């Protein structure tokens, strides 16, 4: 490529010798230096980048020759016949570059000679037939003629000829001779360097793009003229290129430089021209740039918005499909992304209308149902494209109830991979979860279980059933139960692991419901039987824990059921609590091996039962004995002593169990533990004493000898000051 280095070398030498004669007012022989100079463009041995750098080097050095020829003519020192004087040389290239030099000045200095010379220089461009020299001189021409084209906002030196019509036909002819030669870029030179030709096509294409930027600068090109001449004239140059990359760089250049409103009404025409494109075209990026800039104008304020005539929805859909219909050998991700944009636009441009996005995703199922594709796994990129597709509808809708209220939302989820299907299902549920969803209608009640039907066949469900009590809290004095009963049935069909997390809240949701009819006790007259249904419905749900082999959870649940029965006042509640009392009694006595849990049961049973002041002593006493029976079934001593002591409150005879409590404490080995239990009998006597009396005095004396006969540790002194402080409250002085 050293040919290039010696090329610009001879360039400066004649560059500075022409300026030598320029300063000497030797115009004729200075152009002679330029004539021996521009004949370096005669070569074709240089790389297009190599030639491009020299061409820019030449474009700025003839610019110095231009500013010389400019100040000559501008102030009146115009050497005549230059339009013809330059036409004596042999080599074609120096002769022409001087011709444009004279030509542009003749346009500015002589307004009347505008249109005519414009119709000569551009045709004189074909005075060459090379692909490469053809490009650069005309991009050079575009630089020289950049702003001298006419317009409507024109200075009124009315000798001028030519208007915006002249400009548009001018540059379209420039657009013609550039696109044609840029395709002749593809098949020139040697055969082994087709990639070299195409990469340099990616380089000098910006030169042609400058012509298209010239188009945007024309303010006189309005919507009417553009669509009828400039667009079609471009589209004529669009359809005749018969080359992929030539078509690729151009089309995106048309959208990116031409403003939005020009592309507003070209939807039918331009995309029919897109249907005219080759199969090697990146039609995606063309429509990507389309909807990019189109949605950019749809969401820019300070204007009418989008005209009411234009229904982008159906027009896009009809022309989009034709783009699919016209194309041939097409990867899956192509149609997915276009449908993504269809979803994208139909939501953004039509937020308040929901049946529109419905149809597009309805077509999406119809597209891929007709598409003979098997069950979509995660491997191919189609998985990530349809994921991006399905992601948009849920994210975009502000109130996610509209996501749930979609009937055709369900078909989409079927075709996904198990890993993908699980991941998206918990996400869409989480969206119903992470945002506070209020009362949910029966229609969406069936939806959520249907969404559950997609997921199950984790604690995520527990979060769902956690707000289920809220999003399916209803102010109806009947229906709420059916909501819970639907949860009872369908969530019970989920399996066995889940119900341990949801029934204990669903049953209390029934308690809420049960106490909701405590509120409705005066409002309703059937609530007593409805509770009986609910307390039995609890028993049904509790029985679901039984088949789930759960033991302790129903215990307290029966206890509130006993509490709920005894507090509401519905008919037969005493036996219902009794029935539950027998249930909790039986479950405790059946299987549990450990002791502490059994301790918690009876202590919570006895605590509620004392508070359960609706069991008459015809029922209280048999249960009082059964609580005494339950305590006796234990293994270790001090635990039983606490239980029987608590049984004394059930007679509120009291001191009967107190005497037994003393007896149970007398067969322990370690003196450390037995002595505070002695105190725990004293204070127990103290409490009932203040509600029988002399037993307190003797027992205080009894612990006095029982205290000091031991070896001590950090626990001994704690009970000594405990005892002394115990005396301080008995010190009621």
């Amino acid at each position: 490529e050293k040919l290039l280095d010696e090329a610009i070398q001879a360039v400066k030498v004649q560059s500075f010798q022409m300026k030598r004669c320029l300063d000497k007012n030797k115009l004729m022989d200075a152009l002679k230096h330029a004539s021996n100079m521009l004949g370096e463009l005669r070569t074709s041995m240089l790389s297009p980048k190599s030639y491009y750098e020299l061409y820019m080097a030449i474009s700025d050095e003839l610019h110095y020759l231009e500013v010389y020829l400019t100040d000559e003519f501008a102030k009146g020192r115009k050497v005549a016949d230059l339009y013809e004087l330059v036409q004596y040389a042999g080599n074609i290239i120096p002769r022409l570059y001087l011709l444009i030099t004279v030509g542009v000045v003749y346009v500015k200095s002589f307004p009347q000679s505008r249109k005519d010379i414009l119709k000569d220089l551009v045709e004189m461009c074909r005075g060459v037939q090379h692909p490469l020299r053809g490009l650069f001189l005309r991009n050079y021409l575009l630089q020289c003629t950049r702003n001298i084209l006419p317009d409507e906002g024109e200075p009124t030196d009315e000798e001028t000829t030519g208007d915006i019509s002249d400009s548009m036909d001018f540059v379209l002819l420039n657009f013609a001779e550039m696109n044609k030669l840029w395709v002749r870029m593809q098949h020139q030179g040697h055969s082994r360097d087709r990639e070299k030709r195409e990469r340099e096509r990616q380089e000098l294409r910006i030169l042609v793009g400058t012509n298209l930027v010239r188009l945007s600068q024309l303010e006189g090109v309005n919507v009417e003229r553009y669509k009828q001449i400039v667009l079609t004239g471009i589209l004529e140059q669009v359809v005749n290129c018969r080359d992929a990359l030539a078509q690729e760089y151009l089309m995106e250049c048309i959208i990116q430089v031409f403003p939005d409103e020009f592309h507003l009404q070209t939807l039918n025409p331009f995309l029919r021209a897109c249907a005219e494109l080759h199969q090697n075209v990146n039609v995606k990026n063309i429509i990507i740039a389309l909807i990019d800039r189109l949605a950019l104008f749809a969401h820019r304020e300070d204007g009418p918005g989008i005209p009411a005539e234009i229904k982008l929805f159906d027009i896009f859909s009809q022309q989009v499909a034709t783009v699919i219909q016209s194309r041939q050998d097409m990867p899956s991700e192509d149609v997915v992304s276009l449908q993504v944009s269809l979803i994208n636009l139909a939501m953004k441009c039509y937020p308040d209308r929901v049946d529109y996005v419905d149809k597009v995703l309805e077509t999406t199922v119809e597209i891929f149902n007709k598409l003979n594709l098997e069950h979509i796994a995660t491997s191919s990129a189609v998985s990530k494209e349809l994921t991006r597709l399905l992601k948009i509808p849920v994210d975009t809708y502000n109130n996610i109830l509209t996501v749930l209220k979609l009937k055709h939302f369900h078909p989409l989820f079927e075709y996904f991979d198990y890993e993908s299907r699980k991941s998206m299902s918990c996400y869409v549920l989480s969206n119903v979860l992470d945002y506070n969803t209020e009362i949910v209608s029966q229609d969406q009640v069936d939806s959520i279980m249907n969404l559950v039907s997609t997921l199950i066949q984790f604690a995520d469900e527990q979060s769902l059933v956690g707000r289920f009590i809220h999003l399916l809290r209803s102010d109806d004095p009947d229906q709420q139960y059916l909501i819970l009963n639907t949860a009872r049935k369908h969530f019970g069909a989920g399996g066995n692991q889940r119900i341990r997390f949801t029934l204990p809240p669903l049953v209390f949701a029934a308690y809420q419901l049960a106490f909701r009819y405590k509120e409705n006790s005066q409002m309703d007259d059937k609530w007593e039987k409805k509770c009986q249904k609910i307390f039995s419905f609890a028993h049904q749900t509790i029985s679901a824990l039984i088949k789930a082999e759960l033991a302790e959870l129903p215990l307290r649940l029966f206890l509130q059921g006993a509490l709920a029965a005894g507090e509401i006042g519905f008919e037969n509640h005493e036996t219902v609590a009794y029935e539950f009392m027998s249930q909790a009694f039986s479950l405790y006595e059946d299987e549990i091996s450990d002791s502490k849990a059994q301790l918690a049961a009876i202590t919570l049973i006895i605590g509620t039962f004392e508070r359960m002041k609706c069991f008459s002593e015809e029922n209280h006493e048999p249960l009082r004995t059964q609580c005494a029976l339950a305590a006796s079934k234990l293994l270790k001593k001090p635990d039983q002593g606490r239980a029987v002591s608590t049984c004394a409150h059930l007679f509120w005879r009291v001191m009967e169990c107190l005497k037994k409590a003393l007896k149970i404490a007398n067969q322990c080995m370690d003196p450390s533990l037995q002595v505070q239990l002695f105190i725990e009998i004293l204070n127990r006597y103290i409490y009932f004493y203040e509600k029988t009396i002399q037993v307190l005095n003797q027992l205080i004396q009894k612990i006095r000898e029982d205290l000091p006969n031991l070896e001590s540790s950090e626990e001994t002194e704690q009970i000594n000051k405990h005892f002394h402080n115990t005396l301080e409250h008995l010190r009621s002085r």
Binding site: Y88, G90, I92, R126, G127, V128, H130
Partner: protein, 299 residues
């Protein structure tokens, strides 16, 4: 002793108009009075006598307008086709610078003063003072043109040429009889391109046919090699041609002057491929000088 008498020819209208000039042998640049057919010549032969005390005896004094062509650099066939003679003095003496008035009424000039290699057409006034042994022959060259106005018809030479299954082009010369300051405007119209063409060049080439009949010495030179094109074109390309022939200094196409030499000009469409062959096509054009005229307006 120097010359006995110097012959000096000054025309009575040797100051008018302007000068047009022509290039002579060795590239020398000689200027002689431009005339035209039907124009009279008149002047004074200043016979400046140089040697005082001596005398110039003679057998007459005359001046001859001799329009003659010399062919093949030979003096044995110097042929005068124009010969007008004015007698200035009879046999006598020259003792001083005597001015003799001469005037050849309406000198007929059937051909333009043109100079070739083996062709040399000249007009001159030869003063021949007949001395006893050596007549003082003084020559005063005079350039003359061949005038003609615009032609009635200058038809469009529109022809198809090419090489079979290799090339076929339509070249259109808008005119066929141009004058010396014309412009060749036309078009080259491709109909077939299957060759790795490197360029197209148009050569303005003269054939100087010299001699009479079989003695044909046609020297051929390319004054111009005009460039219009480069590279190998494709189907559907139109090539206007624009060539100013002013920078060529051409001579009118002279059709068999005196049946001893002719001047014809041919355009040669020369086409060269990357393998360096040349394809040529020959087309005659007539040239002719037109007028020294006030340049403006056009019919």
């Amino acid at each position: 002793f120097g010359p006995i008498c110097e012959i000096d020819v000054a025309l009575n209208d040797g100051e008018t108009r302007k000068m047009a000039e022509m290039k002579t042998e060795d590239g020398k640049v000689e200027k002689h009075y431009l005339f035209y057919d039907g124009e009279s010549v008149s002047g004074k032969v200043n016979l400046a006598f140089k040697q005082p005390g001596k005398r110039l005896e003679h057998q007459g004094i005359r001046i001859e307008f001799v329009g003659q062509i010399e062919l093949f650099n030979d003096k044995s066939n110097t042929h005068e086709f124009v010969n007008l003679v004015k007698e200035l003095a009879l046999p006598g003496e020259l003792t001083q610078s005597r001015s003799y008035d001469f005037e050849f009424m309406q000198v007929e000039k059937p051909y333009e003063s043109y100079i070739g290699a083996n062709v040399r057409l000249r007009y001159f006034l030869k003063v021949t003072i007949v001395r006893r042994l050596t007549d003082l022959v003084k020559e005063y060259d005079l350039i003359v043109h061949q005038l003609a106005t615009y032609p009635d018809v200058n038809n469009s030479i529109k022809m198809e040429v090419g090489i079979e299954d290799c090339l076929h082009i339509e070249f259109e010369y808008n005119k066929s009889k141009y004058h010396l300051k014309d412009v060749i405007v036309g078009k080259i119209y491709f109909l077939l391109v299957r060759i790795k063409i490197q360029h197209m060049e148009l050569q303005l080439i003269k054939k100087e046919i010299t001699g009479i009949g079989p003695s044909t010495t046609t020297e051929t030179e390319t004054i111009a090699k005009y460039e219009i094109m480069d590279g190998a074109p494709v189907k559907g390309e139109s090539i206007p041609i624009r060539l100013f022939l002013a920078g060529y200094d051409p001579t009118p196409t002279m059709r068999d002057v005196n049946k001893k030499f002719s001047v014809r000009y041919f355009l040669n469409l020369v086409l060269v491929d990357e393998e360096d062959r040349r394809y040529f096509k020959q087309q005659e054009i007539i040239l002719w000088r037109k007028a020294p005229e006030k340049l403006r307006k056009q019919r």
